[PDB]
Amino acid sequence: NITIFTRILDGLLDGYDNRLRPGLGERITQVRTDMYVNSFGPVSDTEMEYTIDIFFAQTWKDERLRFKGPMQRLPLNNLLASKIWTPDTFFHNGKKSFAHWMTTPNRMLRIWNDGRVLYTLRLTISAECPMDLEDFPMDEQNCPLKFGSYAYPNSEVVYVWTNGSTKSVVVAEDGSRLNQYHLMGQTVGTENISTSTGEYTIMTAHFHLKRKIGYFVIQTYLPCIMTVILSQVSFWLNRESVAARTVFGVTTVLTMTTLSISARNSLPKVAYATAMDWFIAVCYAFVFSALLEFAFVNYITKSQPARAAKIDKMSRIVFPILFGTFNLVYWATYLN
Amino acid sequence: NITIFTRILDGLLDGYDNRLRPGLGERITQVRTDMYVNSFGPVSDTEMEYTIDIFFAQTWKDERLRFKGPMQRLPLNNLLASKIWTPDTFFHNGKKSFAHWMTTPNRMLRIWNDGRVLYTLRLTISAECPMDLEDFPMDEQNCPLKFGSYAYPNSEVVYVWTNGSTKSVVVAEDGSRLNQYHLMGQTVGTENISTSTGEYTIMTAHFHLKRKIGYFVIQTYLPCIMTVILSQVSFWLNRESVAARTVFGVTTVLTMTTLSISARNSLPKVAYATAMDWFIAVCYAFVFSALLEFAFVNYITKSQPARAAKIDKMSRIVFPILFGTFNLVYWATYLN
Amino acid sequence: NITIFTRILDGLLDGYDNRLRPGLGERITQVRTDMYVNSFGPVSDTEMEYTIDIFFAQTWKDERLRFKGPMQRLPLNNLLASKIWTPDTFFHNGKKSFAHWMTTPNRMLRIWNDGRVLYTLRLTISAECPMDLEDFPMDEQNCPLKFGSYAYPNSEVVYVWTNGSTKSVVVAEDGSRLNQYHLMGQTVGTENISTSTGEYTIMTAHFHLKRKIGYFVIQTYLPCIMTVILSQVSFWLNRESVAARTVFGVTTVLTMTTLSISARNSLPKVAYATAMDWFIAVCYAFVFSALLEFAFVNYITKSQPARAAKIDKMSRIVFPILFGTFNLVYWATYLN
Amino acid sequence: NITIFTRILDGLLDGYDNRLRPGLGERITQVRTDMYVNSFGPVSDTEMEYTIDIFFAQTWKDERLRFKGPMQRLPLNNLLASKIWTPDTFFHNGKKSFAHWMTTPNRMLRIWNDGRVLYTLRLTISAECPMDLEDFPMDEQNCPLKFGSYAYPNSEVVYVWTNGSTKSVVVAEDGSRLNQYHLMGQTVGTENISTSTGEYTIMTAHFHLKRKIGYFVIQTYLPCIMTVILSQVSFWLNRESVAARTVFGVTTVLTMTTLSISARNSLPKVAYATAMDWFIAVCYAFVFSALLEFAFVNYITKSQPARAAKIDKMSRIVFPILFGTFNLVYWATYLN
Amino acid sequence: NITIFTRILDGLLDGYDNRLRPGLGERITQVRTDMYVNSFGPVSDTEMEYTIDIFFAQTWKDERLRFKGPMQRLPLNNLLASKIWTPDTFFHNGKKSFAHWMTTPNRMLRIWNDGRVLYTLRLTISAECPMDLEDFPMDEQNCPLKFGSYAYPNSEVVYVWTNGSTKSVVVAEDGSRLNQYHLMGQTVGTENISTSTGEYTIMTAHFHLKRKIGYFVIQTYLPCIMTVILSQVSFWLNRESVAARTVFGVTTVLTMTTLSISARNSLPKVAYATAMDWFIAVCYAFVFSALLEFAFVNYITKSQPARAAKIDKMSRIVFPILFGTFNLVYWATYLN
Ligand SMILES: Cc1ccc(-c2noc(C)c2Cn2ncc(N3CC4(CCCCO4)C3)cc2=O)nn1
Ligand SMILES: Cc1ccc(-c2noc(C)c2Cn2ncc(N3CC4(CCCCO4)C3)cc2=O)nn1
Ligand SMILES: Cc1ccc(-c2noc(C)c2Cn2ncc(N3CC4(CCCCO4)C3)cc2=O)nn1
Ligand SMILES: Cc1ccc(-c2noc(C)c2Cn2ncc(N3CC4(CCCCO4)C3)cc2=O)nn1
Ligand SMILES: Cc1ccc(-c2noc(C)c2Cn2ncc(N3CC4(CCCCO4)C3)cc2=O)nn1
Ligand SMILES: *[C@@H]1O[C@H](CO)[C@@H](O)[C@H](O)[C@H]1NC(C)=O
Ligand SMILES: *[C@@H]1O[C@H](CO)[C@@H](O)[C@H](O)[C@H]1NC(C)=O
Ligand SMILES: *[C@@H]1O[C@H](CO)[C@@H](O)[C@H](O)[C@H]1NC(C)=O
Numbered sequence A, B, C, D, E: 001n002i003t004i005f006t007r008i009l010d011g012l013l014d015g016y017d018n019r020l021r022p023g024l025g026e027r028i029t030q031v032r033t034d035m036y037v038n039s040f041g042p043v044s045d046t047e048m049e050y051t052i053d054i055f056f057a058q059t060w061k062d063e064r065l066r067f068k069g070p071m072q073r074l075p076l077n078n079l080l081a082s083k084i085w086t087p088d089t090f091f092h093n094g095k096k097s098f099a100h101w102m103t104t105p106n107r108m109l110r111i112w113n114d115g116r117v118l119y120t121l122r123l124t125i126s127a128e129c130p131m132d133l134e135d136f137p138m139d140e141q142n143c144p145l146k147f148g149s150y151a152y153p154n155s156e157v158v159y160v161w162t163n164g165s166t167k168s169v170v171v172a173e174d175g176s177r178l179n180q181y182h183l184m185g186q187t188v189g190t191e192n193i194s195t196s197t198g199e200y201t202i203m204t205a206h207f208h209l210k211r212k213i214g215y216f217v218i219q220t221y222l223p224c225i226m227t228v229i230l231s232q233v234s235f236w237l238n239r240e241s242v243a244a245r246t247v248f249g250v251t252t253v254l255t256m257t258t259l260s261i262s263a264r265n266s267l268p269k270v271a272y273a274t275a276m277d278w279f280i281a282v283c284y285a286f287v288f289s290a291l292l293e294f295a296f297v298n299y300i301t302k303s304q305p306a307r308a309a310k311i312d313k314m315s316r317i318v319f320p321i322l323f324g325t326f327n328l329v330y331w332a333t334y335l336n
């Protein structure tokens, strides 16, 4: 009974040329692609790359595979995949990709009577996602994914999505979990590119990422805020206690400096100012400014003490007000 | 004499199609799976992955392999494994897996007269274990492991455990050793999933992990506790010694800040508060609060010394009591 | 209809020796090469290596592949690439190179009636780029790329660029993006090398890199500048406040020392002075010099206070002027 | 003349089944194993793994390979290794192993007239060595190495060492060099294991490692010892110099804290106390205790100075004696 | 015309046994080896390994390959390399080696009428170079490289260099560039080794490395020298300024301690004293000694001020002289 299928499989391979695409010199082959994202890999800001695992599926029509039998479908494995012609799809922006072989090469091959062929593949892609870290950490990123033919121009093989955008790409609820990003949604598109060899069709999918804040607040913002408050305490002290107020000014300035170095260790070495950098500079100014006020006061404490006392008392309320006002502008500007 | 076995092996391969599962178009194939964990690999909290080494064994029934001879069993090696049909089992959550080839590919193939087939394989799996580090370090994790068919729907191939749960999965006494976790036990389960291609059966195994405390106590908790005690010593000093008490307040505050940065270097960059973070914040408040008390006292030491002395003496007993009370609540809450 | 192409392909392979180059013992084979750089990889100063991804294309003429048919071109895939003779091109300076295999080996093979053959390949090259970091960070680098034949001397196979330099090598607008470099332009050249085995032709392409400044300014220059300003404040203080001015001198000197160690952590361990190193040394001298001035003043404050006051007041204006003058010379010299 | 050997080699392969072990269904095969360690790889305490390079050799007897000719031995290469039956030996505790292929696969195959077969292989093994770091750094480790059959039970294939223990395993004089360990000696043993599939024979080799001290003395012990001495100097100072003695106490306590964090960075994250940890805690107590003594003295310096002076002078001799006494007990206990 | 070569190639392969060395059972095969080093890889002191890239060439004589034709030479590629017998050369000390495959496996095969065969190969070798870091950083290293046969004893295959030593090994002018080493020269040698399997010939090449100083001077020596000078300034201060001189002593001692920890982070964890370590210890003594002098002076400043002043003034000139004298001895001893 099983032998009936064996004859059908043998017959199809007879007189079959895997080096020739279906409908060669007759028409234009059409391929339908669908994707399912099992998990979104970590995003490496330093290397401008992001990993992703998907189940890429390609469908096309081949008349040479027509057959008749009791079953309309022939589930199979990767053994027969290399015995026929399959598209040479590749990812243009994929720096490094690898497949999964254990326990068995994760591939499927299904054939219908009319000639429809289904070929699903599991892949891990490490693509490149350029970013503009000008509004860091309040930044939105659009990481793309591009794939297409490598040797068949648009006049021979054309890639088109199947059904609507929602069904075209699917992301698992638990897979879309990142430590410092949110996956708002996905979009798809198509475009043509002109190259030296000819014209080719390109399928593009974009992912929208919204960075989540809260890790940097505990890491960088809060230490800066508390350090500024620490310096202001020196004003409430007495002028004659030169040594006491000296410690406050010196220690606070050095504390801000080390935070600036430590903060950018994880951040990519971008050669331009970021929003976080300006916040540190403003905080550095307040602590540095407080030290200057003490030095100026101590320089004139012997000639005109009347004005010196006013400056010492005035700075108590002036500095906190300015620091509070700056924070409202800073957070509001980047959160709106 | 040995030639008798050679003929039997040759006969089975004759007229055998490795591309067709046993009982195709006749019934539903049944597969029994058992696992043995030789060693549980390190758990990477940063990457949310854990490594594991296992001896995966699959058993099924094939009528085409029936044979008769003096021996009821035919021990073999990986050479004959690729000459017949084997299931395309894969791990759904396996990011990266590799096999062992030295000295020889670690695989076995045994055949019985009735047609029973045994196929054991050795694998190293690097799966993903999402975690909710809200009660860190007093947290319990449930790392799963999923595997199933890739091309055969539930209507063709079904996976079921053999015997009870205890025999289904076994973990070595010495293998289940981790630097920062305890392996309390294991559990198994089964479920069905509906996908675009059809319905498939999924076999799931869960591991219960209980993080062991003691490394963080020496690393983070104790330095914070001692630092708080250090600040309280400043109260016993005299008010006029402004410079002396200034050093205590300034140094202690900076000491807590550096610990907060260092502590989270190893921890994953989670964008939410943890139990350990609150403990540091409370400790930071005490040291910061002590500095404020000294500044307030020194500001009124010239007008109303009577109340200033009471505050200085009152803070000696008040602060230790509150700090001790907080610890009992903190540890009791997360240890019950 | 499709069978016509099948016969043509079979005919060419008949009586074809892939071990013999076209025109063996008759003339000298000529090969034309073109390159397209999709993305320029990160430059590792520590390892003196840079990664690059390209689409290498080679063209040559073979009379044995002449054919006649309705189509003048025969698009194909990597399947037929190994059935014929292809050049053994290799990169002389390539420490480690790998190809891309997913989804399919990214290769193309096209044949014309006259015998022209096109063979494009996708590669990732990790070459070596020696650098002279004497004017760091104001330095320009010239990273080369060399390739040629490995077994065919110049008398047999010759490599020559096609068309002008602009068409020979192309770099993508978005691909040429680096965190700490600018890609000004590219150049090409040819040369001959004499070796033990004979004479060979070498094709060389040079890339001009202009390091972008701005990351080191925030990282190293600014902390040094502010630290110097901090020390100068000690002059405005009073001499009798020995402890107060002592803190300024001690803290500033240590601050510069740690920056020197931290700054060179990322930089390669070059055993010679750099421009940045001299800047730190000059800044270290000012802070160290200020401490010496205070010690000298305090040593003679009991014998001849008249001259001590003049030095204290004189240093207020003298030091800032010298520091400002030095910066203009330093920046102008390396920016012109 | 050479053709005589060619016929012999062809004859043996004729009618040879590589899937059947020698003496199948007749007797029990016996295998002799010998090892030579060229170099002992670094021991990773963090990952509890150690690398090793060996020349594994296996010998067995096969009657089917009997031959007659002028030469009693037939040196060969890896080409003929896969044409016959070889044992499926594997390492039970080997997490990851790889072979050497350049210039040629490092394997040998020799055959004698009686049927004796020699098969040597070169391997690199990354095994796991669990450790009990309770007496760290004065700890002794016993890293094992296990190998055996994967599919042939004890009733078919048995592994036994050849000759005495000394000849069984050999370690190169220069290979046994480690940065933080000493290789005292080696031992061998045999045991049987009962599993689900049956009974198997296991060959075990143990290596005795004696950690060498001297790196931690310069790294951790000495800084702690000097820091304790630094605090004692504060006693010789005068009580009225509150600020001076305050600096000694504050700085010393923080210095010990940072050493504790830095010291354990390299050490594995073991969740239990070690001998080194207790030493730091004792040193921390002395420096912390000294600060308490000063605070207590300064609190009563106004009421009863008579007793305050005695405590200040008494602590000068008391503290050094206790610290010296503790060291003798600590070192003697762990060095005996 | 080309067909003439095809027949010659086919004829040689006919009746050719790749499993038998030329002149088997007749004489002893002789092999000539030459090497060319394109680039010397980085030397990893921590792992005691060094990478190297070479073009290894082997030559031998085979009578079975004699042929007659118009051309005396037959350039070829790697395709025919595996069709004949080649030596199983391997590197004894090579921990891990890999070849280059892109664009084509970098191998050559040339044959002459007399039977001379040339076989060149490109390899990357990561060998092991044990070092004795007793005079670090003024140390000279001799990194060897060993290769030989794996299965052919000395009685069958013998390796000998060709021509003089200079032609035997060649190093590129630009390739021999290291960040912290100088390649003075190279040497070659031969030796025999007796093993269990028999006697084998070993070819050895030694490289002489001279570490370049200048990176450690900026990194470790200079900070130590300046720190010592800083402590001496405290002597010029007045005794009554107890707090001022206290800061100098405390800060300097801690500064030296951190440098010792940081300095050895890059250095391998060698368990013995190095020359650099002694320099730090001597520098630590001076700064520590200065603090003791101040404490002793302050202890007797009330009883016998006459002697206290002499010590304070005496130490001003005594300490600089001793420090300068020590440097001359230290540098002269290790630089001669
Ligand atoms: C389709 C195809 C395949 C191979 C080749 C090719 N093969 O040898 C050479 C030389 C080329 C030139 N070449 N390569 C690539 C290329 N891409 C890269 C591109 C821009 C960046 C995003 C992705 O899309 C357009 C354009 C081009 O002109 N040309 N087009
Ligand atoms: C069984 C199977 C095999 C292949 C495919 C398939 N092959 O090409 C496409 C496109 C798909 C779509 N697809 N892929 C995967 C999938 N899994 C992943 C899942 C959720 C997360 C945990 C593991 O289980 C359910 C559902 C689905 O619908 N579909 N089901
Ligand atoms: C073309 C070729 C191919 C193989 C060989 C060869 N094969 O076995 C040996 C031994 C050699 C010697 N050898 N190797 C290499 C070589 N290059 C490297 C070089 C200098 C640095 C930049 C790149 O170009 C010149 C010169 C030389 O003389 N000789 N030339
Ligand atoms: C010999 C062999 C080979 C394969 C298998 C096997 N193959 O599929 C399953 C399932 C098993 C079960 N299994 N696996 C391994 C095993 N070892 C591991 C062990 C303990 C730790 C040290 C090393 O030795 C004993 C026992 C056992 O019962 N059983 N024994
Ligand atoms: C030539 C060869 C090849 C294989 C074998 C061999 N194959 O199975 C076993 C077991 C051995 C034993 N063995 N292995 C190696 C060996 N070397 C390593 C050595 C010392 C260190 C520097 C490099 O040279 C001498 C000596 C020895 O006795 N014996 N010699
Ligand atoms: C790409 O080419 C096809 C040819 O049929 C055309 O229909 C389509 O509009 C083109 N796409 C773009 C974006 O120009
Ligand atoms: C899965 O499908 C099988 C079909 O026989 C059914 O028996 C089983 O109950 C299903 N499992 C679940 C969880 O629905
Ligand atoms: C290389 O050799 C060719 C031989 O035709 C010659 O034409 C060319 O000028 C040579 N190039 C150089 C740089 O000498």
Ligand SMILES: *[C@@H]1O[C@H](CO)[C@@H](O)[C@H](O)[C@H]1NC(C)=O
Residues within 6 Å of the ligand: D154, D190, D191, D192
């Ligand atoms: C293992 O089994 C063999 C069977 O012959 C027996 O001789 C040997 O004593 C057994 N070893 C142990 C440790 O029980």
Ligand SMILES: *[C@@H]1O[C@H](CO)[C@@H](O)[C@H](O)[C@H]1NC(C)=O
Residues within 6 Å of the ligand: E154, E190, E191, E192
């Ligand atoms: C090695 O053996 C050969 C045998 O001919 C001998 O000539 C040579 O001197 C030996 N080398 C050494 C170092 O003993």
